[PDB]
Symmetry: C2
């Protein structure tokens, strides 16, 4: 039942150019801190986010996704004319209509045969996009697919910071405004291909999903997320043949340091097998997983035969887990 | 001579289908009364809604109805039509242009409302007016492989906000001719919802079969129609011209892979942008207008829900017979054109 002929031909990520440190955020919030007596560095000391990146002004999700896509095409050594499917998986989107994917595709110059659309599913959508493309590849509908994802948070910082520093601002809800201050900009793209076209490329096996949509209505997210992941890992054991000790890397979405630690603790996972970029980049939504995988690749951390788990707990709640064999 | 499948879907069926008509009628007559001072200032003497676009009314929800609410209503009805419980659903895809939130997915909200099981996979697909077909295709690939038994594809569209804000903008004493023309097509949209239960054919032997189909694109035209929650700007002239061109390419592909010849199809379920756009389309391809049901005159353009709403209305009217070959066709902002077949 697992995918037999689906590979990863190319992968890339883009780090956004402007740094906004939590120290800087705090300095701006200090007056509002002194009111309401906050006296605690939630971002730096609790969430463990010390910085995030922002794009230049007027960079759209499509722009960021396009930048990542160009780099992933180079990584795959293929021209855009080969791409038969382009899926955009980002939370950030240019418009409701048309798809952000169509705009990225127009920027790249895809052929008139190229099928495009957006998939949206909180921080899990890139994994969903990979599965969707894998099924088309497997059936022989296309030879190469792009899965792209650009996230923008400039506007959310501008508005939230502006809001939080107003004289009328009250606390109880304000504490929830801090959550948006864990988001970061970044982009990633992956070229997937039929395996007979790219021997020796990493193989995508597919995965499993379990949901708890009864919770679609942060402290709560943590516990219920781990409960859900436990269900999903049980499923993974059966369809993927997973055993924690047998996996070489866990590439996981990152909400915060506490959430990641609780996860590692719960599954008895070796923390050395869990790369994290949240400290410097914050939460890049559904782009997080492929950005981390790309960083692992560029750092030479991945060796032929490594078993790599891709996973996340997303708003929904949903939990998806998938395997790549490098 | 042994031949392949052309990669069309095998053993994928439509177990159930439903639509919801939104409750409140807004007539083009009332809209024109509101716009009359602006028409007069701009020298507009023709009824550009009723006579040119060909829309006489559209339906709206209440202000507090979200896309997920409308989608949920359609889904409950589709389950009844398929005579199955929500526990049988292994995939739920939401395909609407309208969206509750950036996150989580509208699909997750509908799923929570319906009470899907913990095995249910859910996500949104967005692709302007073609997304319902994309969702059917995505579900079909899983059903054909036997990964799931049943899937829901759901779509609720809410145009209340775009009507409210567009009418305000278009009645400004200062609105320009250019912006009035830019936003006019928003007054051809309508509210409504649809849902479809798809299934492995072995579970529903007598149900209609879904074959899938073909897509062609012209993404250099991605700027032609841009829409958000409260505004849609549309180059109607170029949509028509470039749309027809794209559809001609797609029809060539349809002939190749679906073996289509227009006279051999029994029904064409065509997404509608406007009466003249549809007339040009039908004329361009020599389609028999009697094989084209339209609801645009009284419901307007319901985006990606349009095709399944019209299919549901056809089923309910008793217009569809066993063996009927039904073409599902649309040109969506992108630009994209998709053509697919259902055998009743």
């Amino acid at each position: 039942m697992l995918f037999q002929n689906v590979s990863i031909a190319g992968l890339a990520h883009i780090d956004a150019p402007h740094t906004l440190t939590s120290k800087e955020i705090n300095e701006r919030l200090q007056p509002t801190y002194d009111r309401l007596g906050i006296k605690t560095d939630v971002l730096g000391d609790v969430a463990g986010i010390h910085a995030r990146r922002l794009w230049d002004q007027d960079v759209q999700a499509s722009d960021a996704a396009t930048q990542a896509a160009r780099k992933a095409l180079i990584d795959a050594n293929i021209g855009i004319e080969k791409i038969g499917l382009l899926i955009n998986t980002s939370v950030s989107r240019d418009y409701l209509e048309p798809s952000t994917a169509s705009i990225v595709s127009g920027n790249l110059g895809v052929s008139d045969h190229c099928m495009t659309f957006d998939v949206a599913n909180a921080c899990l959508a890139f994994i969903n996009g990979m599965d969707i493309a894998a099924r088309m590849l497997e059936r022989g509908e296309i030879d190469y697919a792009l899965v792209v994802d650009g996230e923008t948070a400039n506007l959310v910082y501008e508005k939230t910071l502006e809001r939080m520093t107003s004289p009328d601002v009250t606390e109880e809800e304000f504490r929830n405004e801090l959550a948006a201050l864990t988001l970061g900009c970044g982009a990633a793209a992956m070229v997937m291909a039929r395996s007979e076209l790219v021997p020796d490329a990493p193989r995508y096996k597919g995965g499993v999903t379990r949901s708890a949509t009864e919770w679609n209505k942060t402290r709560l997210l943590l516990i219920e997320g781990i409960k859900l992941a436990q269900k999903t890992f049980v499923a993974a054991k059966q369809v993927l043949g997973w055993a924690v000790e047998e996996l070489d890397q866990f590439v996981i979405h990152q909400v915060s340091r506490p959430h990641t630690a609780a996860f590692v603790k719960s599954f008895g996972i070796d923390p050395a097998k869990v790369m994290t970029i949240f400290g410097e980049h914050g939460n890049i939504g559904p782009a997080s997983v492929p950005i981390v995988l790309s960083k692992l690749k560029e750092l030479g951390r991945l060796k032929k035969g490594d078993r790599i788990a891709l996973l996340g707990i997303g708003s929904g709640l949903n939990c998806s887990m998938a395997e790549v064999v490098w």
